[PDB]
Structure 1
Amino acid sequence: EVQLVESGAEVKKPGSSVKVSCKASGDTFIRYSFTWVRQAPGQGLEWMGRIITILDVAHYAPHLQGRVTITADKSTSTVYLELRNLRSDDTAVYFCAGVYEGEADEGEYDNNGFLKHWGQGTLVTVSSASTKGPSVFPLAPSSKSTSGGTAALGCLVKDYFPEPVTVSWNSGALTSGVHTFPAVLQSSGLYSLSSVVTVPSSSLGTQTYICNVNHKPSNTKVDKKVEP
């Protein structure tokens, strides 16, 4: 079975063209067919096209025909998706996916239409707005709800563009009770997002808490140590 690893998030101006890569590792490349599925924010899935790797032939969705191209290079086990003359409606997460088709290099093909293996996706933002790194502000734990009991704390990742931004705690060690909210588009047109976490309050003075923020689109990677 293959493991698909897609390229990073991208911002693209309306009318430009985007090319997304997908690296496949594992099984024999040519024994797989690959598909690109996209999902506009808050919307369902849209099948884009599929390439029959072995024959190097691809078919596409009627509405995207003419401005989309899917390619695959056996030598690098990489599948490519090229979308041209981008528009606002093209803003979405683009997913790479595939399925084993049998011993294709030995005369057989199942022509499976379903998708078993998926990539992590790639967010593509069609916009003319400027990329901007976020500021990371700490949410101080002075906030006590339970009798001592439970304390809350977090980080405010404010004014960045475009999406996405990832947040982790203690380099990934703290995952219990963590709630990272969906990004929100502010009045400014810039995004903001908070990541909070509840921990036993009797540990504020002994346990160190740090949020690990990353906005790859602007090469901004920050670590904010939160203190009460």
Structure 2
Amino acid sequence: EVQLVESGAEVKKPGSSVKVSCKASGDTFIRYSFTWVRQAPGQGLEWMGRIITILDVAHYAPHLQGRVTITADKSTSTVYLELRNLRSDDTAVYFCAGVYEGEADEGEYDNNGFLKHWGQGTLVTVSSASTKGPSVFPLAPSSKSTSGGTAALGCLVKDYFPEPVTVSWNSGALTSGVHTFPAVLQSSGLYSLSSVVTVPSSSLGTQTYICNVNHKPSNTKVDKKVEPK
């Protein structure tokens, strides 16, 4: 019963090359055939290829032949996936996936296409943009729109890169009744999401609202006071 570990998410620029690692542990390495399955944001699984490890042979996906390679280091027990000539569309979460094959070290081999063990997934952003912390802008609580019960307000993390971004309200307390939207890619090449929390108006002016946005990539942690302005 193996556990697959992957290399870190990498931000590569167009026309470049990226190599993602995948540590295989918990069982006999050569008894597994590993497959890389990529998935672009919003998109769905796309078979990238599979390496019949023990044999050290790997077959690939038509639309990738030439620009992709799958190799395995039996010594360190790792599998690698290399894509060269990166395009923007290559931007996706590259999954490492494996399946048991049988006493392959003994000649037995099921050569299974499905994937029983999956990796945590490694994200690769292939874009011409540059790493840059975000900028949080408070969303004035609808004081002249909603009343009587509760009012909704929030933040607007705009122009950040590469990804991803975490969000919490009031240092991490008011995480309830909040709808943090998936980021969105702007024409510039940057992303921008939004976080909101519909809370009672009678609490505007005592509980200084502050969304806590973090962006490890840029190593820029931001806090913004959402005063009922």
Same fold (TM over 0.5): yes
C-alpha displacement at 1:19, in angstroms?
A: 0.9
**Deviations, residues 171-227 of structure 1 (Å, cap 9, x unaligned):** 877654332212123465432111223456677788787644333332334455656
**Deviations, residues 42-63 of structure 1 (Å, cap 9, x unaligned):** 3332111111222222111122
2: CA distance, partners of 1:63 / 1:187: 26
Q: 1:211 to 1:98 in 2, by over 3 A?
A: farther
Q: Where do residues 1-228 of structure 1 align in structure 2 (5 Å cutoff)?
A: 1-139=1-139, 141=141, 149-168=149-168, 176-186=176-186, 188-198=188-198, 211-223=211-223
C-alpha displacement at 1:21, in angstroms?
A: 1.7
**Deviations, residues 48-88 of structure 1 (Å, cap 9, x unaligned):** 11112222221111221222111222343322111112223
C-alpha displacement at 1:169, in angstroms?
A: 5.2
Q: 1:216 to 1:209 in 2, by over 3 A?
A: same
C-alpha displacement at 1:94, in angstroms?
A: 1.4
- Greater alpha carbon shift after TM alignment, 95-104 vs 135-144: 135-144
- Greater alpha carbon shift after TM alignment, 208-217 vs 154-163: 208-217
Ranges in structure 1 where 5+ consecutive residues have no aligned partner = none
Q: 1:69 to 1:197 in 2, by over 3 A?
A: same
Q: 1:44 to 1:142 in 2, by over 3 A?
A: closer
Secondary structure of 1:105 counterpart: helix
Q: 1:187 to 1:125 in 2, by over 3 A?
A: closer
With normalisation by structure 2, the TM-score equals 0.79
**Deviations, residues 88-129 of structure 1 (Å, cap 9, x unaligned):** 332222111112223333443222210122223233222222
8 Å CA contact 1:9–1:216 kept in 2: the answer is no
8 Å CA contact 1:6–1:121 kept in 2: the answer is yes
C-alpha displacement at 1:18, in angstroms?
A: 0.8
Cα RMSD of the aligned pairs, angstroms, is 3.2
2: CA distance, partners of 1:165 / 1:37: 24
With normalisation by structure 1, the TM-score equals 0.79
- Greater alpha carbon shift after TM alignment, 196-205 vs 100-109: 196-205
Task: Give the number of aligned pairs.
Answer: 228
Greater C-alpha radius of gyration: 2
Q: 1:174 to 1:13 in 2, by over 3 A?
A: same
Q: 1:88 to 1:157 in 2, by over 3 A?
A: same
